[PDB]
Design a protein around this ligand. Structure first.
Ligand SMILES: Cc1cccc(Cc2n[nH]c3cc(O)c(C(=O)N(C)c4ccc(N5CCOCC5)cc4)cc23)c1
Length: 203
């Protein structure tokens, strides 16, 4: 298990997200679905010139999987996935510009315009686990409960084929995001034109 320190500006951003009073927390889902959509666009584009890149799975989609027993909301996609090196994700300029925009009157919902929307997951999650599998590499598990560090390890869990899975270990007061009606409402409000099927699993 390898432990790394976040870049100073990212640790500052994560503390801002965790500490700031901001009621509109539902925007985390739009950000994560947008990231999945980008990864799906990338495999779709790459697979035009190299169709063998789909040997690890032809279906391009997003699954939303709530689990009330584990208090987790999982966002799974069959996008391009990330190599250990990719897992390189640069965000310095975006973070600086976002924190500068907040000081000038922007709100936390504009986070995606700065390439750092992933960190909005910490509005609702005490811990985030990201499992990823790229064609050119092994399956990896990234994880952070903030506090300025994150870990990376080779993942021994169920093989994914290709893509990325974000597991949000929800905060005790944020279990509304495990409810079918609530997730449906959010997807309809913020992610209705995403160009891939979004399947909301039932428990
Ligand atoms: C821990 C950790 C490390 C790295 C990146 C993330 C962010 C993330 N959240 N949900 C995802 C779903 C994915 O399919 C990918 C994925 O497989 N890929 C290839 C991917 C897709 C989009 C981005 N962009 C989007 C615009 O802002 C800049 C980042 C970057 C890489 C990643 C993410 C999290």
């Amino acid at each position: 298990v390898e432990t790394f320190a976040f870049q100073a500006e990212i640790a500052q951003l994560m503390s801002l997200i965790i500490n700031t009073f901001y009621s509109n927390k539902e925007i985390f889902l739009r950000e994560l679905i947008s990231n999945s959509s980008d990864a799906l666009d990338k495999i779709r584009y790459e697979s035009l010139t190299d169709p063998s890149k789909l040997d690890s799975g032809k279906e391009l989609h997003i699954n939303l999987i709530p689990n009330k027993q584990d208090r987790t909301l999982t966002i799974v996609d069959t996008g391009i996935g990330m190599t250990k090196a990719d897992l390189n994700l640069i965000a310095k300029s975006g973070t600086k510009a976002f924190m500068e925009a907040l000081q000038a009157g922007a709100d936390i919902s504009m986070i995606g315009q700065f390439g750092v929307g992933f960190y909005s997951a910490y509005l609702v999650a005490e811990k985030v686990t990201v499992i990823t599998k790229h064609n050119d590499d092994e399956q990896y598990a990234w994880e952070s409960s903030a506090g300025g560090s994150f870990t990376v390890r080779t993942d021994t869990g169920e093989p994914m084929g290709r893509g990325t899975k974000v597991i949000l270990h929800l905060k005790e007061d944020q279990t509304e995001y495990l409810e079918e009606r609530r997730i449906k409402e959010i997807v309809k409000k913020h992610s209705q034109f995403i160009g891939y099927p979004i399947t909301l699993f039932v428990e």
